[PDB]
């Protein structure tokens, strides 16, 4: 769905920009940021492409590692189901 419920722990939409409009980094890349959550280690968390996800159950909801090297992560703006 292209919307989330609660903290979006199970969100599987395609939002790929942070709330500031910055392109998310691919969960499969290690640059500029080396992830703690990536597909190999977390194959059930939907860490596909550069989509915003919540593999760590952040109460603030889905987020992504960002392409900005001075911003490791940030939240995304996701529609509420």
Ligand X SMILES: O=c1cc([C@H]2CCN[C@@H](Cc3ccccc3)C2)o[nH]1
- Tell me which residues touch ligand X (CB under 6 A): 35-36, 56, 58, 63, 72-73
Q: In whole angstroms, how close is the CB of 1 to ligand X at the nearest point?
A: 21
Q: In whole angstroms, how close is the CB of 65 to ligand X at the nearest point?
A: 7
Task: Give 2-68 as a DSSP string.
Answer: -SB-TT-TT------B-TTSPBBPPTT--SS---SS-TTT-TTTT--TT--B-TT--TT--EEEBSS
Q: Is 36 annotated as a binding residue?
A: yes
When the beta carbons of 22 and 73 are compared against ligand X, the nearer one is 73
Known binding site for L-lysine: residues?
36, 58, 72
Known binding site: residues?
36, 58, 72
């Amino acid at each position: 769905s292209e919307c989330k419920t609660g903290n979006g722990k199970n969100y599987r939409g395609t939002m790929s920009k942070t709330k500031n409009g910055i392109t998310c980094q691919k969960w499969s890349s290690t640059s500029p940021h080396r992830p703690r959550f990536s597909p190999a280690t977390h194959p059930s968390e939907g860490l596909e492409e550069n989509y915003c996800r919540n593999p760590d159950n952040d109460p603030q909801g889905p987020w992504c590692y960002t392409t900005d090297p001075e911003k490791r992560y940030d939240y995304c703006d996701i529609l509420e189901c």
